Amino acid sequence: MNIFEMLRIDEGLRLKIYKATEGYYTIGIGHLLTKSPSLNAAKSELDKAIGRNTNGVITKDEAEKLFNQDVDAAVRGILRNAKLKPVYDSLDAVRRAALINMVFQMGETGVAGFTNSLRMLQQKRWDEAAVNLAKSRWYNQTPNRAKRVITTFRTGTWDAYKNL
Numbered sequence: 001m002n003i004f005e006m007l008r009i010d011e012g013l014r015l016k017i018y019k020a021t022e023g024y025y026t027i028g029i030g031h032l033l034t035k036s037p038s039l040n041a042a043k044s045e046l047d048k049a050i051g052r053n054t055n056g057v058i059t060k061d062e063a064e065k066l067f068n069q070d071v072d073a074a075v076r077g078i079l080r081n082a083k084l085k086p087v088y089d090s091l092d093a094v095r096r097a098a099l100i101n102m103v104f105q106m107g108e109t110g111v112a113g114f115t116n117s118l119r120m121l122q123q124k125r126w127d128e129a130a131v132n133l134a135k136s137r138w139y140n141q142t143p144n145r146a147k148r149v150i151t152t153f154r155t156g157t158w159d160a161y162k163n164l
């Protein structure tokens with residue numbers, strides 16, 4: 001298992017524009033297009049991102065290229081974030097992947113605000129951070145996904161994903 005396979009399980013794959021769970025336009029593998037209620041806005045963003053007139057539809061290859069860019073961007077955002085970097089640097093390979101997932105999903109800013117949980121992770125207080133992370137809108141809105149990530153952090157293994 002790796003970060004790509006992991007996020008691919010969590011986000012899924014959709015070749016047409018769709019509304020993600022917060023009602024925002026998305027496509028591919030969790031690629032947020034716009035927060036804006038306009039389909040036009042989303043289509044526009046889509047064509048800009050792909051480099052062509054898409055008519056809200058992309059190919060698999062195109063999905064993946066966006067995915068690759070997004071993973072890369074998530075890792076780089078963590079490495080430049082003064083609050084995330086030190087946490088990331090203290091973790092083992094599996095748990096770094098769980099931090100990348102959250103960043104991918106909620107952005108650098110959202111994650112850096114989990115002040116208390118970050119500190120517990122940094123301190124390797126697995127069980128306590130897992131409980132702290134659960135006390136969030138994040139967990140209440142997307143519980144099954146949040147639970148897979150939380151377990152990852154808690155156990156440091158990919159058990160939450162083997163079967164999926």
Ligand SMILES: [Cl-]
Binds near residue numbers: 049
């Ligand atoms: Cl883009």
Ligand SMILES: [Cl-]
Binds near residue numbers: 141143144145146
């Ligand atoms: Cl969920």
